[PDB]
Short mmCIF file of C-alpha atoms and ligand atoms in Angstrom, two decimals:
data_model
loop_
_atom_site.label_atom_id
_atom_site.label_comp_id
_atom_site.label_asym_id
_atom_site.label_seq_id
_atom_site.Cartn_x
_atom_site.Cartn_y
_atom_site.Cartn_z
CA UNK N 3 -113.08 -72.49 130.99
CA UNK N 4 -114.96 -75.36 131.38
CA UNK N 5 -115.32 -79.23 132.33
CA UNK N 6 -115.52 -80.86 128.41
CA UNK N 7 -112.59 -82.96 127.68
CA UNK N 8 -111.12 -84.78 124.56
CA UNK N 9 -113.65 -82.68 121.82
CA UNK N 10 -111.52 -81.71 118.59
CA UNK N 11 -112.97 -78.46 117.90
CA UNK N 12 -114.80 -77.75 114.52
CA UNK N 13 -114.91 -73.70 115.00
CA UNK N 14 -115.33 -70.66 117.17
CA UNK N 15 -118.20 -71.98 119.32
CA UNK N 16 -118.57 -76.29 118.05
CA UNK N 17 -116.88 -78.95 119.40
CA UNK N 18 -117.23 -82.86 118.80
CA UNK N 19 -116.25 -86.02 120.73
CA UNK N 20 -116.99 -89.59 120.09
CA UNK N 21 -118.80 -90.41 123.64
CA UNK N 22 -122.08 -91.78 124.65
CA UNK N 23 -123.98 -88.96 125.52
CA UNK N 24 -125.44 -90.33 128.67
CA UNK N 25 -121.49 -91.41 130.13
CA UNK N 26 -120.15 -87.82 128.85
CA UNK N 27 -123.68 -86.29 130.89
CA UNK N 28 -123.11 -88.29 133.88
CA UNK N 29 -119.08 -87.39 134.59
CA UNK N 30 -119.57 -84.01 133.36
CA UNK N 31 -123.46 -82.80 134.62
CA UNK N 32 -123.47 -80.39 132.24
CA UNK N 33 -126.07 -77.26 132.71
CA UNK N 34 -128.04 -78.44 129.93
CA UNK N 35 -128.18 -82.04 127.96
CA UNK N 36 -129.71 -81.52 124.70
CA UNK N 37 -132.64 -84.85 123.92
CA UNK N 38 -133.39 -86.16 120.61
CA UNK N 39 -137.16 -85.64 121.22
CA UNK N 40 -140.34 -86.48 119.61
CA UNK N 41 -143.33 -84.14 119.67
CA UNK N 42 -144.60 -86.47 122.08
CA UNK N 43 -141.95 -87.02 124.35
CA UNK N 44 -142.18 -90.52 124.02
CA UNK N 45 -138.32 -91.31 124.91
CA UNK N 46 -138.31 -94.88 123.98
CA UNK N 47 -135.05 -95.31 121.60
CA UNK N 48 -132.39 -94.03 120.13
CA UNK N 49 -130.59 -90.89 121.98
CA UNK N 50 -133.97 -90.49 124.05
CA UNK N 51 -134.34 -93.92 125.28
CA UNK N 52 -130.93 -93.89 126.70
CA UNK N 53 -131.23 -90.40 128.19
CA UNK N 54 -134.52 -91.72 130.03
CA UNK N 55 -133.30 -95.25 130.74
CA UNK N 56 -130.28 -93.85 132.83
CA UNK N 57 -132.77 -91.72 134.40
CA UNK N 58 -134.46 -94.72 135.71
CA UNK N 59 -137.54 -93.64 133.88
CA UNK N 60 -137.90 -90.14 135.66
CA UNK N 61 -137.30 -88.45 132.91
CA UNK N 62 -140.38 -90.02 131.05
CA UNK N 63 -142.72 -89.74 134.38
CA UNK N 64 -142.03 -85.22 133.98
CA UNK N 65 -142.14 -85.65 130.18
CA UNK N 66 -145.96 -87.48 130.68
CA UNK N 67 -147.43 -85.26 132.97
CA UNK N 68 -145.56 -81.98 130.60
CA UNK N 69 -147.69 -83.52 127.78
CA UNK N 70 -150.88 -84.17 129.62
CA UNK N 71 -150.52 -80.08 130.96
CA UNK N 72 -149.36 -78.82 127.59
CA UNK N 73 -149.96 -80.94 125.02
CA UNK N 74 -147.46 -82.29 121.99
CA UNK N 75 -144.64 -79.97 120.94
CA UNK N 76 -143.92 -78.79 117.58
CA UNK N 77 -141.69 -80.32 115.09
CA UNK N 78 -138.77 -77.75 115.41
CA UNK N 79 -139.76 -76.57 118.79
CA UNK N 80 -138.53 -77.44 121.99
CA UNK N 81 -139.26 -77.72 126.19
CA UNK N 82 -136.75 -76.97 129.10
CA UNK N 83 -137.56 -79.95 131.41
CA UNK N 84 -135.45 -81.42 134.43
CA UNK N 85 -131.92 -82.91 133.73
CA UNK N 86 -132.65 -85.67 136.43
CA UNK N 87 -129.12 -87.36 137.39
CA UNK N 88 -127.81 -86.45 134.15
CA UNK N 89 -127.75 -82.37 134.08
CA UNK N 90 -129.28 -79.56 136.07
CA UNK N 91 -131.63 -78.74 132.52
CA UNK N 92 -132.87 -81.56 129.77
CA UNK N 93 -133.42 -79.12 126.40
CA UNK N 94 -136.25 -81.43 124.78
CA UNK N 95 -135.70 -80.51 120.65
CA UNK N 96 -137.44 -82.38 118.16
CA UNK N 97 -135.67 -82.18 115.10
CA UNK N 98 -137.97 -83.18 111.84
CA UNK N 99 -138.06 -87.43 111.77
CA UNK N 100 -137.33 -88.18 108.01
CA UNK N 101 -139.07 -91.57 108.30
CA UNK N 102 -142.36 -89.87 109.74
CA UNK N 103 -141.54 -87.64 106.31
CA UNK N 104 -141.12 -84.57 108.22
CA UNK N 105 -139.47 -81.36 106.05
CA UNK N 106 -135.48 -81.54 106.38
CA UNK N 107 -135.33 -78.31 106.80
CA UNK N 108 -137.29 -77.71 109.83
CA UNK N 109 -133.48 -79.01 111.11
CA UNK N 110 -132.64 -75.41 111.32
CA UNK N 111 -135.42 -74.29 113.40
CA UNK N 112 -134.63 -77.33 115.93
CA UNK N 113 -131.06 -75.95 115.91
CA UNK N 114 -132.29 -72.49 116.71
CA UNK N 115 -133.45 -73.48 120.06
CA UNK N 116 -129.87 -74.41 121.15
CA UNK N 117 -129.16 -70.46 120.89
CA UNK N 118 -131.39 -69.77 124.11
CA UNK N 119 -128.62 -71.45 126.43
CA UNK N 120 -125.18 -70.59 127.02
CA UNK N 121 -123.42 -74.00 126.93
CA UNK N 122 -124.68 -77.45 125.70
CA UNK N 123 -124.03 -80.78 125.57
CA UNK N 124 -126.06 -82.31 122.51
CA UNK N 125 -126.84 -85.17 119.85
CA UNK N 126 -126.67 -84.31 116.23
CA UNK N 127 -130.53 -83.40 115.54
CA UNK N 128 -132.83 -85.83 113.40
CA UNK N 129 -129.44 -88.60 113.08
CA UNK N 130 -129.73 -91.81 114.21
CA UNK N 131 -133.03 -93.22 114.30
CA UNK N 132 -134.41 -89.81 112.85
CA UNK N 133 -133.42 -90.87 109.54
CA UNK N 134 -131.18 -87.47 108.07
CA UNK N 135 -127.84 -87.57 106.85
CA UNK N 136 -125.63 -86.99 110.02
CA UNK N 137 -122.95 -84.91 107.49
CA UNK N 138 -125.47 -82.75 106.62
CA UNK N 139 -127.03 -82.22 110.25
CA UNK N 140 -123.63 -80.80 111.37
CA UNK N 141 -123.41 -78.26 108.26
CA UNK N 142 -127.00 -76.95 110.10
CA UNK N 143 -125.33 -76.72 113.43
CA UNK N 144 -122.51 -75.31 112.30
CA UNK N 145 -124.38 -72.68 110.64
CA UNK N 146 -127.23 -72.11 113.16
CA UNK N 147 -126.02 -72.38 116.54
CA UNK N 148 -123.47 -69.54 118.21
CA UNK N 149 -123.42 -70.59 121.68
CA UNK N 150 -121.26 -73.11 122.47
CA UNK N 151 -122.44 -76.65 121.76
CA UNK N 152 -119.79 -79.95 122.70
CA UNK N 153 -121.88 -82.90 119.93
CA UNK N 154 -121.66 -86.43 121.16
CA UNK N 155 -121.40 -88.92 118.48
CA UNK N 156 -121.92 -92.20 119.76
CA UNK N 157 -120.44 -94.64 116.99
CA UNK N 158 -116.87 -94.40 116.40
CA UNK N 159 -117.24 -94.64 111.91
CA UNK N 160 -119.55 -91.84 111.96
CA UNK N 161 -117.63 -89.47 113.68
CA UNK N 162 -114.53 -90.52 111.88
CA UNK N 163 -116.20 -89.90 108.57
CA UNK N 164 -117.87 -86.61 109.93
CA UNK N 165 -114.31 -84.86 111.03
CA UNK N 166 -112.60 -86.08 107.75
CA UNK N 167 -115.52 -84.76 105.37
CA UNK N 168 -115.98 -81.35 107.64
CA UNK N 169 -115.64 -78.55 105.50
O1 QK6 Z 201 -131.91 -88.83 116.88
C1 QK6 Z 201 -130.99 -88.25 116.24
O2 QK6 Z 201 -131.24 -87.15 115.68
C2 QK6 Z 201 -129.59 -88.86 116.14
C3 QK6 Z 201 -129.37 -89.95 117.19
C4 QK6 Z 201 -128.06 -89.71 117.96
N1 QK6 Z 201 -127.78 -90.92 118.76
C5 QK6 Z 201 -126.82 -90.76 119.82
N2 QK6 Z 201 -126.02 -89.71 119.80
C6 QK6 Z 201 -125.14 -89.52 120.77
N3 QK6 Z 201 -125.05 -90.37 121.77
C7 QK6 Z 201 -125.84 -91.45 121.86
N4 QK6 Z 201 -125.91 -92.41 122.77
C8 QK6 Z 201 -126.86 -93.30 122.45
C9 QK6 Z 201 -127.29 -94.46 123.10
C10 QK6 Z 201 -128.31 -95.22 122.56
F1 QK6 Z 201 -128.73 -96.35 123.20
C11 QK6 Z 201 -128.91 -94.82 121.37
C12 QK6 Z 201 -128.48 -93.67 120.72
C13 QK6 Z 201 -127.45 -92.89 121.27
C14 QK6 Z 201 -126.77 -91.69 120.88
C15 QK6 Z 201 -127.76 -92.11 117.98
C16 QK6 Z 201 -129.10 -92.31 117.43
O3 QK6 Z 201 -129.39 -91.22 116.55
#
């Protein structure tokens, strides 16, 4: 049993909600918000620039000096950081950017990482800003993650249109 509330459940091990991922991290603290990163960790829009805005810009101070120590990540790949105020863990993932012209179906790979943690809290990987068909992102999570993922979707149509075309 735990804390999530209000998800209509897809299968075994996905759930989805229409929240704001920041709210549904603050009330719940999950062990582990999933970011919509880039390879830089450079969190200025879309689910990242919210994530590190309500983190009062922590979130982008650890992410700088991760970079400077490590260097960029790989499209597909992914960094455990700090969850700040939001979570105890922040799983950085940096699904493919289809207006950078990144391959689609490096998607999967992103996905993958989700499978190293028990529970998650998470965006749909490479929507919004990222440029890939949200529809088609959930098919990969669907099909790629088995641990037990509860997807934020922020806007109300999208989700709507995401349940009702779910196969
Ligand atoms: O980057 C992707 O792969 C897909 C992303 C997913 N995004 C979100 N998902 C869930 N909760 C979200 N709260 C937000 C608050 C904001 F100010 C901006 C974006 C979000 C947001 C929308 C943008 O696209």
């Amino acid at each position: 049993v735990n804390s999530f509330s209000g998800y209509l459940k897809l299968t075994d091990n996905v759930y989805i909600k229409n929240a704001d991922i920041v709210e549904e991290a603050k009330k719940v603290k999950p062990t582990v918000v999933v970011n919509a990163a880039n390879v830089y960790l450079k969190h200025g829009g879309g689910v990242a620039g919210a994530l590190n805005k309500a983190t009062n810009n922590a979130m982008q101070v650890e992410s700088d000096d991760y970079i400077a120590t490590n260097g960029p990540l790989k499209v597909g790949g992914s960094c455990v950081l700090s969850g700040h105020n939001l979570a105890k863990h922040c799983l950085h993932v940096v699904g493919p950017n289809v207006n950078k012209g990144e391959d689609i179906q490096l998607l999967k790979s992103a996905y993958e990482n989700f499978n190293q943690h028990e529970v998650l809290l998470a965006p749909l990987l490479s929507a919004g800003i990222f440029g890939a068909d949200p529809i088609h992102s959930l098919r990969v999570c669907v099909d790629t993650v088995r641990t037990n993922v509860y997807l934020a979707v922020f806007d109300k149509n999208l989700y709507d249109k995401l349940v009702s075309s779910f196969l």
